[PDB]
Structure 1
């Protein structure tokens, strides 16, 4: 065997994860979201952009998460052992994997930023994270975390809540699945994505988490409804 010394950064991350799993009673809720309309809308938006920017699926996911957080503010809360702080702004931390570990750059005001602005912010913060130039205020804080591992082929997974937040959305890969249809063949093909929200049961109960996931699924399945 080989003993690799633990860095101070890794020790801090491990201590944060220990604190989260010891003080936050996690419980996980998983749903499936149909992504055909999102893919069509994304293709049309990318065609219209004419190479000025590129809209990714994670941008749609971040926007839908911010809007669902607005609709269900309980998922946008924090437990402080005396009061439940209900944040009125949605600062979406985005999990990014770098050679030094996992870091969470924050897209601030994702509930009011547009898809192009969100995409540009995500690209800029990802480049900063990969280059190791992130400032502490750019990754400390936030009210809701999104960790997307679909690019690695994960069907679904359950993540750890980043304190002091109340939820974290774990995003898996999009795969084509067969579904019943009232057609001659008897079936259709739909590109579905499995998302698992890990909730702090002190703040978000089962009904509230389910309502949040339903709102998120509705927003993704009808992208034009993000205009409302």
Structure 2
């Protein structure tokens, strides 16, 4: 008797429901993507600085900065953060940043609450928080639901760029890669030294967001990435 084995796997309501919602999301939302890169080198040194003071309690990650610039980017241009209500549109002034966490169980969407107000002593322990209670499955689904948008970084493994999933009624969400040194010609002649540009990919629905605007979200966004000090006053 021959081969041809395969596996019929019972599916979990997590996968099943996420699939039923993401499907109608696709059929409803003409997903398109926008991707760019920005040099975090000065921001990485800001990570070694802010962490050279803050090692005393907690550790910081770069993604938190990208999230911060994402919030304020919406504060200056609310047109970026919006929800599709069908007959009308939901434009959210309150900014709650969801995050895509990589766990063996599956995709998790911990929601950040008004991160734009939080400082350097808050958002870190908040992300580490949602990761804490998320890894144990203690976080309730409702705190994974209702988020205005989300953010996901799969680049930890080195993916140049890629396509992600959004969820309704979330207009736009960002997906980030791994910063890879690229050649920027310099006025310094011999030194060509390459700086790492962190891949930043954003999604939008043309029935809600339009290209020029969100593209602007990435324009002033990346402008914040150049000098994160732009967030202070």
TM-score, length basis structure 2: 0.94
Q: Secondary structure at the match of 1:29?
A: strand
* CA drift at 1:139: 0.8
For this pair of structures, how many residues does the alignment match?
A: 228
* CA drift at 1:215: 1.4
Aligned residue in 2 for 1:118: 123
Question: Are 1:77 and 1:165, in contact at CA under 8 Å, matched by a contact in 2?
Answer: yes
* CA drift at 1:184: 2.9
CA separation in 2, counterparts of 1:52 and 1:165? Answer: 35
* CA drift at 1:136: 2.5
* CA drift at 1:186: 5.3
* CA drift at 1:123: 0.6
In structure 1, list runs of 5 or more residues that go unmatched: none
Question: Are 1:20 and 1:160, in contact at CA under 8 Å, matched by a contact in 2?
Answer: no
Q: Deviations over 1:100-148 (max 9, x none)?
A: 2101010110111113311111111012111111113311111121011
Question: Are 2:84 and 2:168, in contact at CA under 8 Å, matched by a contact in 1?
Answer: no
* CA drift at 1:173: 0.4
CA separation in 2, counterparts of 1:222 and 1:82? Answer: 40
* CA drift at 1:189: 1.8
Aligned residue in 1 for 2:3: none
Q: Secondary structure at the match of 1:180?
A: coil
Question: Are 1:167 and 1:198, in contact at CA under 8 Å, matched by a contact in 2?
Answer: yes
RMSD over aligned CA atoms reads 1.2
* CA drift at 1:27: 1.3
Task: Report which of the two has the higher share of strand.
Answer: 1
Q: Deviations over 1:43-93 (max 9, x none)?
A: 100001133111100111111111111111112111111211111111000
Question: Are 1:89 and 1:111, in contact at CA under 8 Å, matched by a contact in 2?
Answer: no
Which one has the largest radius of gyration? 2
Question: Are 1:170 and 1:196, in contact at CA under 8 Å, matched by a contact in 2?
Answer: yes
Question: Are 1:37 and 1:223, in contact at CA under 8 Å, matched by a contact in 2?
Answer: no
CA separation in 1, counterparts of 2:120 and 2:30? Answer: 33
Runs of 4+ off more than 2 Å? none
CA separation in 2, counterparts of 1:115 and 1:163? Answer: 30
Question: Are 2:89 and 2:208, in contact at CA under 8 Å, matched by a contact in 1?
Answer: yes
Question: Are 1:74 and 1:204, in contact at CA under 8 Å, matched by a contact in 2?
Answer: yes
The answer on 1:28 being equivalent to 2:33 is: yes
